[PDB]
Design a protein around this ligand. Sequence first.
Ligand code: HEM
Ligand SMILES: O=C(N[C@H](Cc1c[nH]c2ccccc12)C(=O)Nc1ccncc1)c1ccc(-c2cccc(F)c2)cc1F
Length: 441
Amino acid sequence: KLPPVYPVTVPFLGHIVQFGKNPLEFMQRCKRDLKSGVFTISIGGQRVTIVGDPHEHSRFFSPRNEILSPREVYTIMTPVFGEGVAYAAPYPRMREQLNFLAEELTIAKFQNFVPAIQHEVRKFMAENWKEDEGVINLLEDCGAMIINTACQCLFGEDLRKRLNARHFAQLLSKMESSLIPAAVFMPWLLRLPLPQSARCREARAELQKILGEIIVAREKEETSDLLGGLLKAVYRDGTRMSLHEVCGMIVAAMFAGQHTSTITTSWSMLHLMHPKNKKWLDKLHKEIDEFPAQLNYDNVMDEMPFAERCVRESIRRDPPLLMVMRMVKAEVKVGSYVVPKGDIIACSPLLSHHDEEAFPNPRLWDPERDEKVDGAFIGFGAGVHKCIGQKFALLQVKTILATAFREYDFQLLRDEVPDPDYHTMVVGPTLNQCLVKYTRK
Ligand code: HEM
Ligand SMILES: O=C(N[C@H](Cc1c[nH]c2ccccc12)C(=O)Nc1ccncc1)c1ccc(-c2cccc(F)c2)cc1F
């Protein structure tokens, strides 16, 4: 039982085009006009099957790569993380590799983090929000704090000194400068692509070059950072990581967070400041108002369940990553239908999070809601490939919120909360809507 196919009106580009303008509405359209939402868009002549049903998510996450591999679809990353580094490494290694990062971003590895990140914020604002009140772009400053903060946590002083955040940021940016989201048909498209790499690849090298130097430098003198920790790692056979792979994993760490976290932090501030949500804002404050000026792990990790709620909804309502794809290397059965081998198969947070059965009044941002279908919230993916940085991210967000709101109040210079800008790789509030006003308490 092949799933319905939205008929293709213009031979080569219509869906890719139609999705670009309004994917949510587009996708829903197929759900709507084919009745049963396990449809199959065609993108480039690639049959693409979207699993639109919360109930049948489980089928999307669970099958192991040898049945549903992202290695094929995410190939575009390969210049960035490095040849053989991640999805470009056979699954024993990839799994091994990913597993090592995860172990660096575990809640154990956070003992000292909160003040570090809490610092950078108090530092940043003070430096960029001098006046009692002023006007700033929110997206950007969240963007600056996110990056800034991560570095404070995940990188050592020598290292931080040798390559400061701003430079990283530019470094990182050059790397997406490469990226082209063909992922839906992306794999095949790789014929002789222009060195979109050329800009980035240089960037990877410069990072690596640096990374070596600290290692060389550090060892001379006589250490627990992200770099330090990855080096200690050993594969199951018993080989260590090659700084090439080390450099890649670090890139992954900075890469995943940069937009998703920024967008998340931002939305969350955006919704909380808005006047509709006074109620929620007051709730937060009771939560955070007795927190000691100095902030420590426990306040954030343990004593902030609501705030977490707020972040999760923000992601739930407008998730940064619109969808997830796997390459079907074997025929598999989703509910009634069956999906061909060789059909790229995708699952979308953006859609499932607006299925009205599981998220009714999806556009209402309620931090206190709870999914009415399990695994409907997939903002951080699910099953095998669960996000491995989410705990870290949340940590970042919840701290920025407590710190910012605690000493500031914000006024949204737009009548309504912004509109999502879908014209980006990772989807966020529109940069222009984001103007926002701040008043030192
Ligand atoms: C707001 C922040 C974030 C959001 C919303 C987010 C969301 C997600 C989602 C939905 C997935 C599943 C993608 C898929 O199944 O292909 C995922 C996977 C992943 N995320 Fe994140 N993520 C975030 C932050 C991070 C950070 C900071 C890291 C840092 C390393 C990270 C690393 C990963 C990795 C490695 C995977 C892949 C799991 C695998 O391939 O097995 N993420 N993330
Ligand atoms: O920007 C993207 N991907 C980036 C880099 C990245 C790719 N594979 C990863 C696996 C782990 C970590 C990072 C990445 C990333 O950072 N993703 C990420 C994933 C998990 N956690 C954190 C971050 C990206 C965004 C959108 C689309 C897209 C959406 C809808 C339709 C469509 F056709 C394309 C595709 C994208 F490739």
